[PDB]
């Protein structure tokens, strides 16, 4: 299942409600093509990996999340688990989400 974070309040709550499954966040931009261009993958994994939690963040309308995460390049994939960070990587690499997810799965 996916989860949209419109405020830092929903950010921490997303990790808390995420249970203990892996959690990948997509810091993209709905107005930016190159960022949303990777949605047919990250968001698609929602059906191929129903055992993984996927989040979404608007680096422009939710600058509070990007601010605390100091994001300077989109899309930025960040991995969280039980509210703790384990790894992260930016750069359009949808195939990497698979290898990274299967890594900390």
């Amino acid at each position: 299942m996916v989860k949209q974070i419109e405020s830092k309040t929903a950010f921490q709550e997303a990790l808390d409600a995420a249970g203990d499954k892996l959690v990948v966040v997509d810091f993209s931009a709905t107005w930016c093509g190159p960022a949303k261009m990777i949605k047919p993958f990250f968001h698609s994994l929602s059906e191929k990996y129903s055992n993984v939690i996927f989040l979404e963040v608007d680096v422009d309308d939710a600058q509070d999340v990007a601010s605390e995460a100091e994001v300077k390049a989109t899309p930025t994939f960040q991995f969280f688990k039980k509210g703790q960070k384990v790894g992260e990587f930016s750069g359009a690499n949808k195939e990497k989400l698979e290898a990274t997810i299967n890594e900390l799965v």
Binding site: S28, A29, T30, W31, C32, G33, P34, A35, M37, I38, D58, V59, D60, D61, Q63, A66, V71, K72, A73, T74, P75, S90, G91, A92
Partner: peptide
């Protein structure tokens, strides 16, 4: 509007 920094999606290389 909603603009911030560069989107290095399939734009980088």
């Amino acid at each position: 509007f909603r603009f911030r920094y560069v989107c290095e999606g399939p734009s980088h290389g």
